């Protein structure tokens, strides 16, 4: 086509989706990770995670308002990944890298899994 | 903070939101523009438009499944702007620029209004 493109548009959209999440606006699901609860937008979770994409395209699970993750999932690792989904920024630290990588593998977030593998390999 | 950032994350999220729109997955509103109907995600519309942001933060309008736009709004101009919201690409042409600019002013999409003004000024 002969379209023009606004370079900052995708980043501006994601910033506004994170503002809606922070104010709990039009969030339609709560993700339960052991004792912890995280409110989010189903569409953003699907857009970021192969696991959520599979869950919310399922004809019965698409209608659930609560999703319980596997008990082995660490709430902090989930929180870090949820923040990444809505911002593009990953808070990866020596103290959380193992939990973040395991959560990213479970959530099927291949680019996160890739950077965790590389950061671990460099420390070996 | 000490975060790392994935450069293509925002663009990848927007691409997946457009894929969900094309397959009509988790769309929660229909925008009526005279005889034409457009299905979309309320969160994406709010993230792109000052008008939709105001509409869907309203305590009664947030729950509507159908929104009717002003009869002066051109369906093609709306279609072009909806495509822009989900892709960052604007199909701006001599034959549609006036309808696109008027629709962008109504929808409160200031960056689109700005490029339309500049493209019109250059042709004068």
């Amino acid at each position: 086509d002969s379209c023009i493109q606004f370079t900052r548009h995708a980043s501006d959209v994601l910033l506004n989706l994170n503002r809606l999440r922070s104010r709990d606006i039009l969030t339609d699901v709560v993700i339960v990770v052991s004792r912890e609860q995280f409110r989010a937008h189903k569409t953003v979770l699907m857009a970021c995670s192969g696991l959520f994409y599979s869950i919310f395209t399922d004809q019965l699970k698409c209608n659930l308002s609560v999703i319980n993750l596997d008990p082995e999932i660490n709430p902090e690792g989930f929180c870090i990944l949820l923040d990444f989904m809505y911002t593009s920024r990953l808070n990866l630290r020596e103290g959380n890298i193992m939990a973040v990588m395991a959560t990213a593998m479970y959530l099927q977030m291949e680019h996160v899994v890739d950077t965790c593998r590389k950061f671990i390999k460099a420390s070996e | 903070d000490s975060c790392i950032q994935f450069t293509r994350h925002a663009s990848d999220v927007l691409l997946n939101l457009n894929r969900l729109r094309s397959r009509d997955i988790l769309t929660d509103v229909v925008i009526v523009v005279s005889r034409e109907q457009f299905r979309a995600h309320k969160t994406v519309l709010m993230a792109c438009s000052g008008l939709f942001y105001s509409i869907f933060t309203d305590q009664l309008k947030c729950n509507l499944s159908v929104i009717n736009l002003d009869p002066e709004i051109n369906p093609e101009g709306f279609c072009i702007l909806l495509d822009f919201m989900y892709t960052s690409r604007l199909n701006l042409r001599e034959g549609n620029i006036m309808a696109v600019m008027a629709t962008a002013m109504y929808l409160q999409m200031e960056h689109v209004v700005d490029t339309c003004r500049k493209f019109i000024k250059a042709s004068e």
Binding site: I4, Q5, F6, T7 | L90
Partner: peptide
């Protein structure tokens, strides 16, 4: 704005 750019030519993509």
């Amino acid at each position: 704005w750019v030519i993509p």
